[PDB]
């Protein structure tokens, strides 16, 4: 029972595609054409954080909107004061190859991981006056590409072993394992309510997961190459992905289909990171051509360009108040834009 | 006070970069890698640190990475050299083993992240190759060949099909070495070939070449 069972799979896939097209009344660009364009956005480099001596791979804002972590493969995990450009902490890492880092929404912990297949958790609020290693989560067989705290107790990680995992940091074991992808999972994005999350993988597909259950609720396709970046819309009813085919796409969770594409003919490089502004009107994408493009998220127009890095921009984040944007790069510099 | 803490951190961050710039970073690919690792084992990803004649080497073995190399290969851009390990005694084995090494060697050698990175080729298991070459012909692996059964000619033919896979010429070197497990020269050869890489890097930085 393989050929007929597989034919049933195609028949159900065809039925799914018919359902998505059936509900697609009008494209987003037809109804949003009545909106006034954002116009032009010129963001100046307000701060330049220079303490890293290698390529910067990941950065994360603290919920304070003032503190942020960065990870470089010089073996360092630095916490910055973005107002005074001061260095709060400098955490040395056991393994230099880090591909991700996270900040606990409470501000007491920092997480990072990479080519060692381990998500280490660091305590930022020790009584002895130093940042310690509080936990080393070791359950993946492939490199760790993203990780984000749900609280001070449980964290979700993606990996190159094609699976995502939810962890209990107090015990150090996977509470649930999320399976179903075919290629490496490159990114994940927590929903604002922190009961759902999306993950994009190297099979050019994004899947929506339920944290408590452990099952795929929906699957999203359309990208022609690996999905390197993914971010949730501020209201949590949509998310945007950045792929290697030089396109970003906005996917709706209710309509179960893509809304619009953010691509330009002169852009022939892969997207390394994506982000949204506080109002979800600006999609900020980092590109491999050494600069970040600001996109009008409702009209699919490039509203601005953050051209200030000598190498490709690896990471991209917006503060929880929308005041600033941070961009890291392989040129070893983080820059804050406003 | 807080500003003075940031400056103290800068001092130690910049002192760490100086220490990390005096070390030779080697990427180990391949086969016989475990032989090479165990040969210079003086002291997801397995990192081996050893010291030879005042140089500190860091080998990074990525054998236990079952993922898409395209995603993490760029992390090793900037290594001094790549040690590629091939087993001579595996050409009649199984598609063909010797053509799997050739397919992988062409991938890394012509990789865009490794345009200037020299390759140290280790053709391992020469004792088992010289016994099987007299027992079985090399035509099983290379249908086009003349010196049917002889270690010297067969090995030279193999070594020539690995250095002819190099498309970038005058951009980097390939330092080929024949090595049995009993060999006790491997570390010296890596040190000798690394010293050549360093010197060529100094002259290229000054624009002299």
């Amino acid at each position, epitope marked *: 029972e393989l050929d007929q069972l597989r034919q049933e799979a195609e028949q159900l896939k065809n039925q799914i595609r018919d359902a998505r097209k059936a509900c697609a009344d009008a494209t987003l660009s037809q109804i949003t054409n009545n909106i006034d364009p954002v116009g032009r956005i010129q963001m100046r480099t307000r701060r330049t954080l220079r303490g890293h001596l290698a390529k910067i791979y990941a950065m994360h804002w603290g919920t304070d909107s003032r503190l942020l972590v960065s990870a470089s493969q010089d073996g360092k995990l630095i916490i910055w004061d973005s107002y*005074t450009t001061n260095k709060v*902490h400098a955490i040395p890492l056991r393994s230099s190859w880090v591909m991700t880092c996270a900040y606990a929404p409470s501000g007491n912990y920092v997480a990072c991981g990479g080519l060692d297949n381990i998500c280490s958790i660091y305590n930022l609020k020790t*009584r*002895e*006056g130093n940042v310690r290693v509080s936990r080393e989560l070791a359950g993946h067989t492939g490199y760790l590409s993203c990780c984000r705290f749900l609280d001070d107790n449980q964290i979700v990680t993606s990996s190159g072993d094609t699976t995502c995992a939810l962890w209990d940091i107090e015990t150090g074991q996977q509470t649930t394992t999320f399976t179903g992808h075919t290629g490496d999972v490159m990114s994940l994005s927590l929903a604002p309510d922190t009961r759902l999350f999306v993950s994009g993988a190297c099979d050019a597909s994004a899947k929506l997961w339920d944290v408590r259950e452990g099952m795929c609720r929906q699957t999203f396709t359309g990208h022609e190459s690996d999905i390197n970046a993914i971010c949730f819309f501020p209201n949590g009813n949509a998310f945007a992905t950045g792929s290697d085919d030089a396109t970003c796409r906005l996917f709706d969770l209710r309509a179960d289909q893509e809304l619009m594409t953010y691509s330009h003919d002169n852009i022939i490089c892969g997207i390394t990171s994506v982000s949204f502004s506080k109002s979800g009107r600006l999609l900020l994408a980092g590109y491999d051509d050494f600069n970040c493009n600001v996109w009008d998220a409702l009209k699919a127009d490039r509203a601005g360009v953050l051209a200030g890095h000598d190498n490709r921009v690896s990471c991209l984040g917006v503060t929880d108040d929308g005041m600033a944007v941070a961009t890291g790069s392989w040129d070893s510099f983080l820059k804050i834009w406003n | *006070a*807080a500003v*003075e*803490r940031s400056k103290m951190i800068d001092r130690n961050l910049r002192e760490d970069g100086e220490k990390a710039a005096r070390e030779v970073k080697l990427l180990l690919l391949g086969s016989g890698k475990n032989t090479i690792v165990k040969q210079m084992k003086i002291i997801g990803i397995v990192e081996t640190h050893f010291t030879f004649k005042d140089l500190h080497f860091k080998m990074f073995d990525v054998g236990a990475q079952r993922s898409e190399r395209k995603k993490w290969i760029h992390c090793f851009e900037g290594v001094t050299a790549i040690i590629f390990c091939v087993a001579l005694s595996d050409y009649d084995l199984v598609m063909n083993r010797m053509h799997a090494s050739m397919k992988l060697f062409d991938s890394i050698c012509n990789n865009k992240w490794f345009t200037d990175t020299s390759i140290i080729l280790f053709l391992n298991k020469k004792d088992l190759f010289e016994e099987k070459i007299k027992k079985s012909p090399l035509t099983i692996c290379y249908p086009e060949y003349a010196g049917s059964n002889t270690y010297e000619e067969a090995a030279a033919y193999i070594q020539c099909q690995f250095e002819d896979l190099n498309k970038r010429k005058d951009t980097k070197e390939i330092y080929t070495h024949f090595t049995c497990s009993t060999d006790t020269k491997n570390v010296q050869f890596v040190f000798d070939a690394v010293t050549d890489v360093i010197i060529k890097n100094n002259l290229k930085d000054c624009g002299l070449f």
Partner: single-chain antibody, 232 residues
Framework: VQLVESGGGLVQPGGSRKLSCSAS????????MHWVRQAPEKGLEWVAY????????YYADTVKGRFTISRDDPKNTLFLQMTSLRSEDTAMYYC??????????????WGQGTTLTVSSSDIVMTQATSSVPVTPGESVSISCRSS???????????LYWFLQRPGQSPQLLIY???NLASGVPDRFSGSGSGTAFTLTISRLEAEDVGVYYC?????????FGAGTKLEL
């Protein structure tokens, strides 16, 4: 965490003494250390300061030129070499650890103190009263004043509240006027306007009795309040 000092005792005028403060159980090299003294039944008085790494050193003019703050990071020891000891130098000197980064609590732990006895511009901080009788379960309010405003352009108000229970060393309660220290019950609270500050204690308990101190960290020399005592 443990700061234990030694080197105190009785000395004749004109002599010199060296106090020590050995640290145990924390990253001593990453902390700026202060010397704070408290004359018999008078109040708190900051003496000096040495930065982490020995970069900065500060003194109070009352003792500047005769004392010196030295540090030995490998041994985790802090010294106070004192010379020309007058009668006014009689006091209990305390070793206090301080760390300054964004969000830190820079007066969190105090040593046990060591008694020194000698035989026979600045911001003024005033505490309105010196004794306040109350019974357990009643909300109390303490207040103190400053000459300058402690509110900076940062938005930080550098006012600190301490509590020295009978027979013990001071313990931090509030740092920067609104932030509760670590390990203190959440019934304490601090508020102010920039020059007028207050400390409100809800559901007062038996062990909340002692002299409350209000300190400014806006500028050097660091100055303490007179000291408000809660009576029961």
């Amino acid at each position: 965490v443990q700061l234990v000092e030694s080197g105190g005792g009785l000395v004749q005028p004109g002599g010199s003494r060296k106090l020590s403060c050995s640290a145990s159980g924390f990253a001593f090299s990453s902390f700026g250390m202060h010397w704070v003294r408290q004359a018999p039944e008078k109040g708190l008085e900051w003496v000096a300061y040495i930065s982490s790494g020995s970069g900065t050193i500060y003194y109070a003019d009352t003792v500047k030129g005769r004392f010196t703050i030295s540090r030995d990071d490998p041994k985790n020891t802090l010294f106070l070499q004192m010379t020309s000891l007058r009668s006014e130098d009689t006091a209990m000197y305390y070793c206090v650890r301080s760390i300054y980064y964004y969000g830190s609590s820079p007066f969190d732990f105090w040593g046990q103190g060591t008694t020194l006895t000698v035989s026979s511009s600045d911001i003024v901080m005033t505490q309105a009263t010196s004794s306040v009788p109350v019974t357990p379960g009643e909300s109390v309010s303490i207040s103190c004043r400053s000459s300058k405003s402690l509110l900076h352009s940062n938005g930080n108000t550098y006012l600190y509240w301490f509590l020295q229970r009978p027979g013990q060393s001071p313990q931090l309660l509030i740092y920067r006027m609104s932030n509760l220290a670590s390990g203190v019950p959440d019934r304490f609270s601090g508020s102010g306007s920039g020059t007028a500050f207050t400390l409100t204690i809800s559901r007062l308990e038996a062990e909340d009795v002692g002299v409350y101190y209000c300190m400014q960290h806006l500028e050097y020399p660091l100055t303490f309040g007179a000291g408000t005592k809660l009576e029961l």
